[PDB]
Every structure is written in C-alpha cells, then in structure tokens.
Amino acid sequence: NTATAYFNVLNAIDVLSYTQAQKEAIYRQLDQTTQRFNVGLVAITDVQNARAQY
Amino acid sequence: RVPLGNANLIGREELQHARDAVTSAQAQLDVAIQQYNANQAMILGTKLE
Incomplete structure (x- = not known):
C-alpha cells in the first residue's frame, strides 16, 4: 500500500x-x-464551439 | 487578413500570398487599361464623318 500511494x-x-x-x-x-x-472570416457557431472546448 | 498577422495569428506565407495577389491584380488591371488606351488611339474622339 505504501508503494502504491507514492x-x-x-x-x-x-x-x-x-x-x-x-x-x-x-x-x-x-x-x-x-x-x-x-475580422470577419467565420460565423458565431465557431466561436461557440471554441468556448465550449475551452 | 493584415490585422491577424499583426498579432501573429496566421502564418507569414498567408500574408505574402495575399500581398502578391494584390500586386498581380494591379498588374492585370494595368494591362487592360493600356489595351483600351491603345484602341482609343485610332479614334481620338472625333465625329463619324
């Protein structure tokens, strides 16, 4: 048990x-x-997915 | 595309390609303009008669 805990x-x-x-x-x-x-190259859905992943 | 590069959020090759595209488009426009000017040398804005 000692070894396992370490x-x-x-x-x-x-x-x-x-x-x-x-x-x-x-x-x-x-x-x-x-x-x-x-800057205007993607949609809001991409930002929502990035926020979920973060 | 420029602002993303300002902050280092895209590769520099992407900026080089975009700038070269602008230059190439400018050159093509110059070719077209000079062709049109060449055509207008035979008229000189005179009436038909």
Whole structure:
C-alpha cells in the first residue's frame, strides 16, 4: 500500500502538468478564432464551439 | 487578413500570398487599361464623318 500511494501521487503530478499545457493550447485557439470572427472570416457557431472546448 | 498577422495569428506565407495577389491584380488591371488606351488611339474622339 505504501508503494502504491507514492506512485499514485507522482502520477497525479504528471497528469496535472499535462492538463495545464492542454489548457494553454485551447486558450490560444479560442483567441485565434475570436479574432478571426471579429475580422470577419467565420460565423458565431465557431466561436461557440471554441468556448465550449475551452 | 493584415490585422491577424499583426498579432501573429496566421502564418507569414498567408500574408505574402495575399500581398502578391494584390500586386498581380494591379498588374492585370494595368494591362487592360493600356489595351483600351491603345484602341482609343485610332479614334481620338472625333465625329463619324
């Protein structure tokens, strides 16, 4: 049990780092889509999908 | 397309292509205008007789 708990904690740390990177990527994608819509190349549905993914 | 590039939200090749397209369209318009001017050299805006 001691060994299992140790390794579970380590795995949690790694997963947290991965999800942080994912969040950064999705945020930048949302920024790009919103800017493109403002400039007039896409529709509102794309912004809604980007917001859902974020 | 320019403002997206200003913020670095598109590739630079996309801006190069758009600018080159503008230049090429300008050149084609110049060709057409000079052709029309060449045709008008034979009339000089005089009556039919």
